[PDB]
Amino acid sequence: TLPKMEPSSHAPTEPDIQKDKDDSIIRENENIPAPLGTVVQLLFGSNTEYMQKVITRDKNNVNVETIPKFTPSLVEGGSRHYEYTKKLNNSIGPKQTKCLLTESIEHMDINNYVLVTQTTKTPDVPSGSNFAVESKIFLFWGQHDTTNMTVITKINWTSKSFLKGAIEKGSVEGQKVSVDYMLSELRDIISRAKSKKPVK
Amino acid sequence: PMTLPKMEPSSHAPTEPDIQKDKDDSIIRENENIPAPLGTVVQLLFGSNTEYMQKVITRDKNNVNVETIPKFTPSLVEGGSRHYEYTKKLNNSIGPKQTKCLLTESIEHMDINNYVLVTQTTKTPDVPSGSNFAVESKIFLFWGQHDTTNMTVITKINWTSKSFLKGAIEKGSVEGQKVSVDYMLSELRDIISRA
Numbered sequence A: 001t002l003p004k005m006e007p008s009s010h011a012p013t014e015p016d017i018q019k020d021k022d023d024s025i026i027r028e029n030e031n032i033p034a035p036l037g038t039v040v041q042l043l044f045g046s047n048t049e050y051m052q053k054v055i056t057r058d059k060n061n062v063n064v065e066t067i068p069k070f071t072p073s074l075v076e077g078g079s080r081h082y083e084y085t086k087k088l089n090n091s092i093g094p095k096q097t098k099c100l101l102t103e104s105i106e107h108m109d110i111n112n113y114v115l116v117t118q119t120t121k122t123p124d125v126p127s128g129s130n131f132a133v134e135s136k137i138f139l140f141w142g143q144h145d146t147t148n149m150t151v152i153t154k155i156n157w158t159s160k161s162f163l164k165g166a167i168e169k170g171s172v173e174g175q176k177v178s179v180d181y182m183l184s185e186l187r188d189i190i191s192r193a194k195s196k197k198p199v200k
Numbered sequence B: 001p002m003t004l005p006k007m008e009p010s011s012h013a014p015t016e017p018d019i020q021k022d023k024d025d026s027i028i029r030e031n032e033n034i035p036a037p038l039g040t041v042v043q044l045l046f047g048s049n050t051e052y053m054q055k056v057i058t059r060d061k062n063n064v065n066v067e068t069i070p071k072f073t074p075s076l077v078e079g080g081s082r083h084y085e086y087t088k089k090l091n092n093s094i095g096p097k098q099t100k101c102l103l104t105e106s107i108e109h110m111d112i113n114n115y116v117l118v119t120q121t122t123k124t125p126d127v128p129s130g131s132n133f134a135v136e137s138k139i140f141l142f143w144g145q146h147d148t149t150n151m152t153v154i155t156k157i158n159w160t161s162k163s164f165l166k167g168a169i170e171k172g173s174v175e176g177q178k179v180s181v182d183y184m185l186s187e188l189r190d191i192i193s194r195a
């Protein structure tokens, strides 16, 4: 059985998105067939094995350290930090990069929506000392007590860079890949808890 | 293992197919990246050297008695098709420990400038209620970023007669194909990185 939060049932809701000029929507209104509180617990709850599965579902993510729970707790103002290594295409860049991820709970209301903001640094990529990646993961109620996910991203430039265009695009396209894995791994965790594995 | 098959063009901007999802359809895997040009991946799965597809099938530990795979006839083009068979061992089964799988593949669309659509129709006679359905699985291949290939697989059950196990079969099929598609992707990524 999958973790639950209250309320377990709710009418569809809308996140309070503050889109900016530099922001691109990666995926929008992506449905996940389980109540909001369940999905929030899968990605962000105290059993961090599910988030661990989300990251290692991408073959290119390696050396994933253990994911801590959110402290002080899973609530607005909570945060956590972890790292892993992402293999890249070495013809357009370096063969891999460390990824230093900070997640901050910006808003958490299971009656309405959840906003977890990822701030990520990639020290090994060209111009990696000039920017951080901001990724906003919104979770909200979809139809029939399901969950919709929307992900928005931008580059926070802390210094000027000659790679500005390549980094913003690579970041968007790379995150289409990673969010598609996250959505698929979440859908798999839900469908595996509900049914018997018919092979293997 | 030394050189991979090619088709032209070898380079192209990203494309996306009309996956035409309906209410009875389920996504198996979507937008899975394969780091090789579209014509290369198409040749690996469907080209006349069928050794690569044979390797894809036998990479799945649940597949046994994998016969030689024929090429598409009349040839690899829209309207071409092929037929092959193997046996899939089952896990938490309600019936037998394994089932024969009778596969027909049809090329519904093939344009290396755009996308390729191969539809698999599979019959599993030995499973409970197996005389009431065939499995339809659509494999879409299209251009991803940087001259790579994206794959999307969508599946539904074609019920030819009434069935009371309808719910479990539709779910068992999605779950089993998630497994087999992940094995296919890992073998394809294996073949490309070894080249």
Ligand SMILES: C[C@H](CCCC(C)(C)O)[C@H]1CC[C@H]2[C@@H]3CC=C4C[C@@H](O)CC[C@]4(C)[C@H]3CC[C@]12C
Pocket (backbone or CB within 6 Å): A086, A092, A093, A094, A097, A099, A118, A120, A122, A125, A126, A133, A135, A163, A166, A167, A170, A171, A174, A175, A178
């Ligand atoms: C900065 C580089 C692009 C560099 C372009 C260059 C220098 C090779 O031309 C991009 C490409 C891949 C991006 C990662 C993809 C996915 C994620 C997961 C998400 O949860 C957190 C952000 C992260 C790690 C992206 C960071 C920026 C990356 C490395």
Ligand SMILES: C[C@H](CCCC(C)(C)O)[C@H]1CC[C@H]2[C@@H]3CC=C4C[C@@H](O)CC[C@]4(C)[C@H]3CC[C@]12C
Pocket (backbone or CB within 6 Å): A198, A199, B088, B092, B093, B094, B095, B099, B101, B120, B122, B124, B127, B128, B135, B137, B165, B168, B169, B171, B172, B173, B176, B177, B180
């Ligand atoms: C019909 C059964 C599920 C129902 C079994 C029941 C009712 C006993 O639980 C499913 C489970 C495994 C499914 C196969 C998984 C893999 C593939 C490969 C794909 O390329 C072609 C379809 C096929 C053979 C699935 C057929 C349906 C199967 C046997």
